[PDB]
Amino acid sequence: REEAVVWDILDEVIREHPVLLNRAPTLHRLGIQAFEPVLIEGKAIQLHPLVCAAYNADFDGDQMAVHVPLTLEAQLEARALMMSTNNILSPANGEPIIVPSQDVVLGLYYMTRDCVNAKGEGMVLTGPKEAERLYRSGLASLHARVKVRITEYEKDANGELVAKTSLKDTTVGRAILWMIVPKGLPYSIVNQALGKKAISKMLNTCYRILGLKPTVIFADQIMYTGFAYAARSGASVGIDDMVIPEKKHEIISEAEAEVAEIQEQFQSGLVTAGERYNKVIDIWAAANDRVSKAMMDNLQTETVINRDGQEEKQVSFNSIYMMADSGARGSAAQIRQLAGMRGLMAKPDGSI
Amino acid sequence: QDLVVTEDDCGTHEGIMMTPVIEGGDVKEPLRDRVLGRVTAEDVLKPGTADILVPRNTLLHEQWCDLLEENSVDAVKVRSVVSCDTDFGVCAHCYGRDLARGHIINKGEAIGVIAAQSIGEPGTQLTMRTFHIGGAASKDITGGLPRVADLFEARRPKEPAIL
Amino acid sequence: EIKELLKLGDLPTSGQIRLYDGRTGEQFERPVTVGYMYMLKLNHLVDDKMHARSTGSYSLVTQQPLGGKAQFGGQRFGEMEVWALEAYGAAYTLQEMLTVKSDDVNGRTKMYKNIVDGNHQMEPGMPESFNVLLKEIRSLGINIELEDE
Amino acid sequence: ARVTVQDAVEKIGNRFDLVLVAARRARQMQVGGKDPLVPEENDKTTVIALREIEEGLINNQILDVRERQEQQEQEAAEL
């Protein structure tokens, strides 16, 4: 009959009671992890983003299994040995397996990355709170270059923490992320433009200096702010974002006249079929590399469109380039096929 | 399956001498990364810059590893599972750090199972990764794992070197 | 041709538009690609996939719970899934799944009563499927006996 | 204790023995109705036990001490 008092009772029982989530195939031990359940109305299980790595879980319809540890002993085993918070590092290599991915990386990249002047270049800010205030008031971009007074804690020889106030040269965005950063870590870690690869090192550093509890809080924090800024950015994918280099058709016609040369040298019966095959393939591989270089030069630094005195050159904020540069998604290889030349395909024989 | 941490210290002096992998020229795997979180079997006294002895049966913390780099240690004897004297398992010392914990391994842990899973999984996963995806040509895993299997199965090669 | 069609709509050539966050009212930092994608709802309704079971019918010979949601089944905790628990060292959880949660007949009933009485005590025995194995081996004509303590 | 068990593990040391110790204590509270040291703050037995161990109140050897103390006084009462 599912009576209303039964819901209160159910809520009572599940508090502090760990449940095991599993995803197939269970290749390593982290394919089963324990969590505190949060009861939700609605028929799907909700999984935490940061452990999607270990499960290899992507939500294209994936399913997971739930198990109830029954005994006091099993419940203890789950909370102590199997809890997601307790099992961060890969048992295979000594590396944190919980690392921000995708949108989170993207967002952090967006905040940390700098642009030329923009809104409020060379401002002076009291604390990162003033920065947050200014950004959200709409008097400063996240990429505005600025001077900011940060108080960074360096942990002493013993457990005691020694802090030091310093005026640093960073963006508004970086100052705001410093608020997520725990005291103990340095400011220079966040002072760079952040990507997936820098953030794994961030997490590692935090684990080694601070320990488990701090890192767990920090990881969640990073996730919240990451997504948060990912959304605010308004980052999207239009056909204009895939830039073809102007010199495609030229490069290609040249490569075709070249291949024609080796074909005519073949009809003469001089150059063997195998020699020609190899030379044609080398021609096209080299053409491919050339077009790709052109694409990436024209994209990576296409922001040749700046300011303050006169014309200046800078990193491109094109959406695909950002995704790829941050390590959030895509890579130069992918982008080659999108904007560049697709390149040489391999037969089912393996031959090209 | 059966391999478990049975003992704290086997009381052995044995172990393998790891060098930094300079296959070709580039430092493929730095000494530090290859040796971190291992027990030092045997010191090496080279008078040096930081005056390092680093005594026997010391787990290499990130601290001691940093000191190795400053001193430019060449190669080091490290205590290993293979060289353990513990019968019916291995000792915590010969294993070293439980990589998943970030400290010395606890006795009782079923290490074998962890090892097999850790080695097996990437192969099994990369067999799905660069194949649902693996498309265009600029190998992969399908060539590699047969080599690996031929190794773990101890198959003598078709035309072997003589010693 | 498509951009010319967008100009006939007085829509941007980029096909990206200025969008505002419904919560805050402020605009997003840059233009977002917006338009109509033709989308489908596939046959995989969560309604059909959701499933849960505490206790129910059990299999005929092996005595372990049946499989599949239509037969009100338990999930299989397979070799792969067992290895996970070995790795962790979660011994009681493992044993639990092998015994009180599966074949162990006495164990399951006793465990249920203990759970209703609060005390989450493990009272494990021997999986009936093991018993059966021995019997199968003896029907083969191999003497396989337990030498007791 | 609830989220992270790190400090509790640092008190006892062996994760597996921490499990055993907290479970034996939680069983006492569950069955015997043995009184908690730390304020429950509406928490379950297992969580109580882990807090207690973290703060360094419960110990395998300390449990063995209270076992013998009370059992021995029961034997004295019998005789």
């Binding site: 002993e73 085993e77 040995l81 | 478990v4 006795k107 009782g108 842990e109 079923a110 | 070995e86 962790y88 060292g89 979660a90 011994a91 009681y92 044993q95 | 597996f16 023995d17 499990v19 055993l20």
Partner: peptide, 19 residues
């Protein structure tokens, strides 16, 4: 005979060794 079970298993093993 490993992990959580090592404690109980060594207790059983000492029972086996003393008869």
């Amino acid at each position: 005979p490993a992990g959580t079970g090592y404690a109980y298993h060594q207790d059983r093993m000492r029972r086996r060794a003393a008869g």
